[PDB]
Symmetry: C3
Subunit: 273 residues, 3 copies
């Protein structure tokens, strides 16, 4: 096993408090909360309770309740069914590190569990609808994957070592897990092909509906099906500066002391050129 | 707060009856039903009970039950988790008016809550899969939105007034909310860009998968990514007639007395040309 | 009524055992399990219990539990909310036969209930995100379908027989239900138009995001919006051999005795040319 998003938060911030469950629990959540005292949330006080909304619909009910004016996000509450949500600290998602202020949808965390990704960067914004799938094998008479359920030991072996010896890397085998940089935007209905992409450059923008079939260089704004660059983010000199200064690894104080360097693209250039 | 779809229906049609809950309640639903007598649905009689299916899967179970032969849609039953469903009367959806016989999916109601839309017309058919998102800011060194969580008062102010002064209207700021006309069809996997669209013309057809990036004139059938017209609905003289006669604002009696004007496009033209 | 996926499995494999419910039941599931003894799963033994995970999230919890090491898929457990999941035997899905090792998502089973499909083949792999919708009527002044809710008997009749007399087959009327062959791959965000497609050839590959608007001949690899062939699977002589040998109708013993005929495309050709 390994820790879920909620478990990681509770480790940090629960601080011996009781867990006030806001919503109908699921068996998975009840396994998580088994070591703690917990109860169906009634009257709640952040000094004594940490509130776990089960679903995002359960969260909206809580935040509409006057009782939640005192609760601070992450420190005092969290949604349980939200493994790919943003956090103010670096977290883990099935041995995939993801930085701060970084969210994604069920498709991506799904890809994380499969191991299609090695890391997601900082301040990265991925739409819920986006999907990341590998490709099936093209070298054989079949493309069905679940035919593998019918194979014995002997058929499994001969099938499983033909996949390992493949250039086009089916099922994301034989390749490095994908790497998604910081300050990336991925739009709705998008697709990144895990069998052929190894890295998405920092600050790259994927237009919505676009279908990425190969690595996107840093700051390449890409649309259309498949994905070709229509515009770059900034000048190539500005690109190479951002990759050394690494403002996304900054502290919070460094963000609020160099605000207007971030707000103005070329005001930044004077300071870190 | 403001009234949900269910609350609006119950106001109209509950008429002092008890609410028979068909399904496992959610905390959000239980907040809604708090003022009324309600119970886990067992034997139900529309003379005494109004049946609220919690989920759409709960609804199918009810409609398969022989007990539901006597219940009429809206008047006697409704799904709770169905904020974007059709209704025989004009309704509200987060201060967004939507006409009669008009449905949409979770993406659109999501856009409604954000305020990306000003109104949805009558007899409008929007696929569940469709999504409506704004664009992030392109004028800065970053595109991440949730970096805003790290800003203090002072950083928030300088960041928030640069957005207000923007031509491309990021986050749907500084622009009129979108307006969706009557008799519109939007297909599956579609996308309308809330940062750049202000109005979708009445009777416009969005082909599925199409990505609308700018206003669609009335009756423009549009496909492809992005969205360009491949065909118009009717002749331009027929277009300008429909915009004055406004058959979608008709009564029910006017629909059933002028049936074959609606069924035949050019039979309509003789009456209202 | 007709039998769901779970009911069909339980008929085959329950064998007088008790149903151990792993998760929060739904009213629909509780209707299914009404004839059997069943209980909230605690300590479970496949000799005495069949475990029904309600949701797929409930399933992952079960499979992470050490108690599930003894349970075999289908024979001893199954997800309830998974009507379009793979099975080792041919099954039914709303009078739509689907072969072995064949899965699809909520869109397709949705299309099945509508009757847009006549059969799904063997070893067919359809992404969850794929959608299958018919087209609305284009012959009239309106495209809204739910305006039909406002029609009386008389308006319904004149409206319903104009649809039956249509070349473009709106609402999948007047046409054969769609047929999906064996060994088909359909990718994410895809769309097959039920109003214009009658058959997808065996072994056809639909690239993800592609929008199929007309029949795909066997083994045509198709991408882009709309869907045009960029490559065929195998040589046209190999195509016509696979359609007679029909390896997807094989037994399991025939799969494991002719493994390397399936793994190697042209090694197959020597045996069955
Ligand atoms: N507020 C509407 C809510 O949105 C939900 O999720 C969708 C979307 O809104 C939601 O928004 C995501 C959240 O996830 C995540 N927790 C924080 C992130 N900043 C936010 O960002 C997203 O929505 C922001 C609106 N602040 C937009 O500014 C931003 O453009 C967009 N990327 O992510 C989903 C993407 O598709 C549900 N769709 C809807 O039912 C619900 O009501
Ligand atoms: N009947 C199948 C059901 O469909 C559900 O939702 C999908 C679709 O079917 C459903 O259908 C919508 C409903 O929403 C809404 N309440 C009324 C509207 N007339 C209807 O319309 C939609 O389905 C009609 C089939 N009358 C089609 O005639 C019409 O082309 C299509 N726009 O909207 C969703 C769009 O994607 C679930 N996908 C599936 O699980 C369920 O079983
Ligand atoms: N393992 C991740 C899980 O995936 C889920 O569903 C998605 C996907 O993964 C899932 O996978 C389907 C299953 O359905 C179905 N029961 C068996 C089938 N062999 C499998 O196949 C799919 O995932 C396989 C990963 N073996 C891939 O090898 C294969 O390329 C892909 N078609 O189908 C969905 C397609 O979109 C959820 N998205 C996620 O929450 C969950 O955690």
């Amino acid at each position: 096993g390994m820790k879920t998003r909620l478990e990681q938060v509770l480790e940090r911030y629960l601080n011996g408090r009781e867990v006030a469950v806001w919503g109908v629990p699921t068996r998975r959540l009840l396994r998580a909360l088994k070591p703690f005292k917990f109860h169906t949330a009634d009257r709640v006080d952040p000094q004594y309770h940490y509130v776990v909304a089960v679903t995002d619909d359960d969260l909206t009910d809580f935040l509409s309740d006057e009782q939640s004016k005192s609760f601070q996000y992450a420190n005092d509450y969290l949604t349980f069914d939200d493994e790919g949500g943003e956090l103010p600290f670096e977290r883990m998602c099935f041995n995939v590190p993801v930085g701060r202020q970084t969210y994604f949808g069920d498709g991506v965390v799904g890809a994380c569990e499969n191991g299609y990704i090695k890391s997601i960067g900082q301040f990265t914004s991925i739409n819920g609808t986006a999907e990341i799938h590998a490709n099936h094998q093209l070298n054989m008479t079949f493309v069905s994957d679940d035919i593998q359920n019918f194979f014995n030991e002997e058929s499994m072996a001969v099938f499983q070592e033909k996949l390992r010896k493949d250039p086009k890397h089916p099922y994301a085998y034989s390749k490095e897990p994908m790497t998604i940089g910081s300050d990336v935007y991925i739009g709705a209905h998008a697709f990144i092909n895990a069998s052929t992409v190894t890295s998405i450059g920092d600050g790259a923008i994927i237009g919505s509906g676009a279908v990425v079939l190969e690595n996107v260089p840093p700051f390449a704004v890409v649309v259309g099906v498949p994905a070709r660059i229509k515009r770059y983010r900034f000048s190539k000199e500005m690109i190479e500066t951002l990759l050394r200064v690494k403002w996304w690894d900054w502290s919070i104080e460094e963000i609020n002391e160099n605000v207007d360097a971030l707000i103005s693209p070329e005001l930044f250039m004077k300071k870190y050129g």
